[PDB]
Symmetry: none
Subunit: 80 residues, 5 copies
């Protein structure tokens, strides 16, 4: 058998809706997703840190260090 | 048999709705998802930290260190 | 069997809607996505840090170091 | 079997909508995407850092170092 | 089988809409994308740093160092 393989999606008259087959990956931190819809309305706001991993080896090493956001200012306006 | 393989989804007349087959991965921290819908309305707000992992080995090592967000300011407006 | 292969999507009368087959990758930090829709309306705001990985080896090494955003100012206006 | 191959998408009467088959790559940090739509309206604002990877080896090495944005000012106007 | 090959997209009556088959690449940091649409309206603003990679080896080396933007000023006007 293989190593680390991923089959396809939505074929041969595909259908349905979702999130599938993620390895070591990040989805979010301020994001909107709309499809096949009528009059959608969405709002997102995030202050965040994300860290992820798949298959990691190490010897006398240091791997993945993250220091988050600090000391920022932000302003977004209105939408009529 | 294989190592770390993932079958496909939504094929041959696919259907239904969901989240499946995630290994060592992160989904969230401020996110909206809508599909095949009429007049959806959604709001999300997050202050967060997320950390995840699959298959990790280590010897005389340090792996995955995270310091979260600190000292920020944010403002989002209105939507008529 | 192979190593690290990914099948295709949306073929032979494709259909449906989603996110699939990501390895070691990042999706977000301020993003909107709309398709096949009527009168969509979306808002996103993010202050963030993201880090991701797939298949990593190391010996007497240091790998992936990230220091986030610090001390910025931003202003976005209105949309009639 | 191969090494690191990716099948095609949207062929032979393609259809549907999404994000698929990413290896070691980044999508976001201030981005809008619209298609096949009527009267879309979108706003994005980001202060961010992103880092990603697929298949990495190392010995007496240092790989991927990132110091984020610091000390900037920005102003965007209105859209009637 | 091959090494690092990518099939085509949108052929033989192509259709649908998306982002697919990226290896070690970056998409964002202030970007708008519209197609086949009526009266679209979009705004993006970004302060960012992005770093990405696919297949990397190293021995007594240093690879990928990035110091982000610092100390800038910017102003964009209005659009009636």
């Amino acid at each position: 058998g293989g190593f680390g393989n991923q089959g396809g999606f939505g074929n041969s008259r595909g259908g349905g809706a979702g999130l599938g087959n993620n390895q070591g990956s990040n989805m979010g931190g301020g994001m909107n997703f709309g499809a096949f819809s009528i009059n959608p309305a969405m709002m997102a706001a995030a202050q965040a840190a994300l860290q992820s991993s798949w298959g990691m080896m190490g010897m006398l090493a240091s791997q993945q260090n993250q220091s988050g956001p600090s000391g920022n200012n932000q302003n977004q306006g209105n939408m009529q």
